[PDB]
């Protein structure tokens, strides 16, 4: 199957309280492998998966140095943006950046991406062609023209189609047992009568990796998202994931209702009507 | 492996 490597960066300004909060995090698929926090003890990029600790001193020195530069640009960016939108110095604002690459099941380059947010909404992004930019408003138009003139896209392209996919492959083979595993969801099925005329059916899917899963509720083939309560996929905290789906059922009908689980751990997309 | 050439906005 596909794999990805993504890096997430977050800078938050702290008016009156000094330098911004900087938090950086790296993922391969749904596995955090590295972290940096400006408030933590070490002042270094730090391991978060077993298979990345085997990297030597050079690796961590450069990662640390790079992420310190990412911190440094974002600290300056908060001051630029505040200037750009003429906002006061009293407020706390947020910068977010996300970059990385997808590879196919052959492990060749599939997609690269690099986006940027200011206060939680789109500021600037690389388009899929890895050559041009979408700037979200008139202030970001400035940044686009600046970055077009300074050939930023070409530099990014080299990373995204090159280094990004090279290092992903190294990670995917260094953590084979960790990252190339697939854990099928343990299913479970609960029913509690709410009130006399009404019952709730609830479909569980637990202990699964990776996080992408689909549960749908359905009568006679026709799927029912009119009654459906679907929670967000949530971390168990051991490396796997959890999700539930529910419906509001008129009781005495719970044989013609079916729950539909699919996940890449499943050879067959599972059905579970109530016992 | 992170990106080695981050620039300003």
């Amino acid at each position, epitope marked *: 199957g596909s794999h990805s490597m993504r890096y997430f960066f977050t800078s938050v300004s702290r008016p009156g309280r000094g330098e911004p909060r900087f938090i950086a995090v790296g993922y391969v698929d749904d596995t955090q492998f590295v972290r940096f926090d400006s408030d933590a003890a070490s002042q270094r990029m730090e391991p978060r998966a077993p298979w990345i600790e085997q990297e030597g001193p*050079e690796y961590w020195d*450069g990662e640390t140095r790079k992420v310190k530069a990412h911190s440094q640009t974002h600290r300056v960016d908060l001051g630029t943006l505040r200037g750009y939108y003429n906002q006061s110095e009293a407020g706390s604002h947020t910068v977010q950046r996300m970059y990385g690459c997808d590879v196919g099941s052959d492990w060749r380059f599939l997609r690269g991406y690099h986006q940027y947010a200011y206060d939680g909404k789109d500021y600037i992004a690389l388009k899929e062609d890895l050559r041009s930019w979408t700037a979200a408003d008139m202030a970001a138009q400035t940044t686009k023209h600046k970055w077009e*003139a300074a050939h930023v896209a070409e530099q990014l392209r080299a990373y995204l189609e090159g280094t990004c996919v090279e290092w992903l492959r190294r990670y995917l083979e260094n953590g084979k047992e960790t990252l190339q595993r697939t854990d099928a969801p343990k299913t479970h099925m609960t029913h509690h009568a709410v009130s006399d005329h009404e019952a709730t059916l609830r479909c569980w899917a637990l202990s699964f990796y990776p996080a992408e899963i689909t549960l749908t509720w359905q009568r006679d083939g026709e799927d029912q998202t009119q009654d459906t309560e679907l929670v967000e996929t949530r971390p168990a905290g051991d490396g796997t994931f959890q999700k539930w789906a529910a419906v509001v059922v008129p009781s005495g009908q719970e044989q013609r209702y079916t729950c539909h689980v699919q996940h890449e751990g499943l050879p067959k997309p599972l059905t579970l009507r109530w016992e | 492996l992170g990106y080695g050439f981050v620039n300003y906005i």
Partner: T-cell receptor, first 110, second 116 residues
Framework: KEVEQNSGPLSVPEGAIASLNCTYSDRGSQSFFWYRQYSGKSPELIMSIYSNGDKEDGRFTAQLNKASQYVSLLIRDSQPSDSATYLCAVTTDSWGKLQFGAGTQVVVTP | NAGVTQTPKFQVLKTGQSMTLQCAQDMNHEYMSWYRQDPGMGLRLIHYSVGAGITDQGEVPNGYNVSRSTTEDFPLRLLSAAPSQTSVYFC??????????????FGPGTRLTVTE
């Protein structure tokens, strides 16, 4: 010795091809350069390469092989004024030191 | 459009004399470096600076002194000259975080001779 370069000197007659190599020793390296330094003056930059494969500018071609950790430079159709020493430079990031090889002295004979 | 300039081209000193090597740059670059070059052992890094106001040492700092008040200028000071400071000195500049293509351009160099 971070960046290992071609010993030298390297004598090539005019119209021929000078191939230069260097090897670097940090896998995380993301930037690759060739400098030309004439005797008694400053290194001038002639070729930058950022991704695997070939970049061509004029009579120069640089190749990159990130797997083998190998940067090279071919000079087709030599002039006697290509005679100089050629340094490869390698870096990891904007804040990483630029790592220089010792340089290969290339002499083009008429 | 003038790139890296530096001053002077040539220099002779007695042991113990002071001099300062001027170095300037045109391109709003943050990262500037000072090197020496010597016949037997290549380009060697003396001091460098990744922005205005701040500097750090390289692999051969000893006896050389540096500051960076403004982003444009990166002067190198030799307070008391030693006969082993005889060398070609090259100033250099990269964008750092500022810029475009991350190429480091060199200045034309200063050839310095120190004699007893």
């Amino acid at each position: 010795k971070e960046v290992e370069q071609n010993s030298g000197p390297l004598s090539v007659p005019e119209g021929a091809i000078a191939s230069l190599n260097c090897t670097y020793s940090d896998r995380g390296s993301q930037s690759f350069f060739w400098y030309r330094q004439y005797s008694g003056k400053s290194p001038e930059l002639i070729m930058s390469i950022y991704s695997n494969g070939d970049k061509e500018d004029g009579r120069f071609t640089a190749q990159l092989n990130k797997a083998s950790q190998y940067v090279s430079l071919l000079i087709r159709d030599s002039q006697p004024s290509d005679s100089a020493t050629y340094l490869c430079a390698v870096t990891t990031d904007s804040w990483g030191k630029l790592q220089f090889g010792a340089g290969t002295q290339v002499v083009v004979t008429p | 459009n003038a790139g890296v300039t530096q001053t002077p081209k040539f220099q002779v000193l007695k042991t113990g004399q002071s001099m300062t090597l001027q170095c300037a740059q045109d391109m709003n670059h943050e990262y500037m470096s000072w090197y020496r070059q010597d016949p037997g052992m290549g380009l060697r890094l003396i001091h460098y600076s990744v922005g205005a106001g701040i500097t750090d040492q390289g692999e051969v700092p000893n006896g050389y002194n540096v500051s960076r008040s403004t982003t444009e200028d990166f002067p190198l000071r030799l307070l008391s000259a030693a006969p082993s400071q005889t060398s070609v000195y090259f100033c250099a500049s990269r964008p750092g975080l500022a810029g475009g293509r991350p190429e480091q351009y060199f200045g034309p160099g200063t050839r310095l001779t120190v004699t007893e």
